[PDB]
């Protein structure tokens, strides 16, 4: 439950194995699913099995998703495999903050 004065940002993920062996070795079920939901929103992701290009040794991937839970609202997470779980939430704020791409050095 969000019982707080402010919005919560939850970051979570879904694991895409390279092989069915990998899938069942980790999660026992042959086919995973992840469902994350509030009262006014849901996202159900089915994990996909198969090879991707080697990156730092792996053919596997994780897909990242997000969910914002408003005060009074309630987060529910449902899964029978492949869930990369959140360990908590990020505070949300509003203001003048942004981001920029640059290689200019920083000065005093």
């Amino acid at each position, epitope marked *: 439950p969000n019982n707080d004065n402010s919005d919560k940002l939850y970051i979570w993920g879904v694991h895409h194995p390279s092989t069915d062996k990998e899938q069942t*070795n980790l999660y026992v079920q042959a086919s995973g699913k992840v469902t994350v939901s509030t009262k006014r929103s849901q996202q159900t992701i089915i994990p996909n099995v198969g090879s991707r290009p080697w990156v730092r040794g*792996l053919s596997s991937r994780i897909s990242i998703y997000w969910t914002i839970v408003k005060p009074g609202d309630i987060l529910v997470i449902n899964s029978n495999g492949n869930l990369i779980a959140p360990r908590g939430y990020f505070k949300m704020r509003t203001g003048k903050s942004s981001i920029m791409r640059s290689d200019a050095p920083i000065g005093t």
Partner: nanobody, 131 residues
Framework: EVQLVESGAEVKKPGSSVKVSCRAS???????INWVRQAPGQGLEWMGG????????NYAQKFQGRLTITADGSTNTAYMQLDSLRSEDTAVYYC?????????????????????????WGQGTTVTVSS
């Protein structure tokens, strides 16, 4: 903590096949379970290992084709099957594994990363190959 208990002594005709069991007294699946034998008058000989979690096997090449190491997760049991028994296979067969625990486990390392010093041994099963 965990103790391993192997099945009872057997006797086999040459050519026949033998299957020894290893029963853990607790969950013992995350790290490499090893089979190691000793024939009369010889030093210890490593047969191979399984990592129950992944079902992954490693065999000494000398036994490839007649050695099968197998595991069942629900009953906490590992098995060793050796076919085409010659008399050289007369030996005491031990099963053994490490006692390490880890708060953060690795789900994709190389087999060898799951092999650790063997500090929990079964009592050993004498298989004697004779006519």
């Amino acid at each position: 903590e965990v103790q391993l208990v192997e099945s009872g002594a057997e006797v086999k005709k040459p050519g026949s096949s033998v299957k020894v069991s290893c029963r853990a007294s607790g969950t013992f699946y995350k790290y490499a379970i090893n089979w190691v034998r000793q024939a009369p008058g010889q030093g210890l000989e490593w047969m191979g290992g399984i990592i129950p979690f992944f079902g992954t096997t490693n065999y000494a090449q000398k036994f490839q084709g007649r050695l099968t190491i197998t595991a069942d997760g629900s009953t906490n049991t590992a098995y060793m099957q050796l076919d085409s028994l010659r008399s050289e296979d007369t030996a005491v067969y031990y099963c053994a594994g490490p006692s390490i625990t880890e708060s953060h486990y690795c789900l994709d390392c190389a087999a060898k990363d799951y092999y650790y010093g063997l500090d929990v041994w079964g009592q050993g099963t004498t298989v004697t190959v004779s006519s």
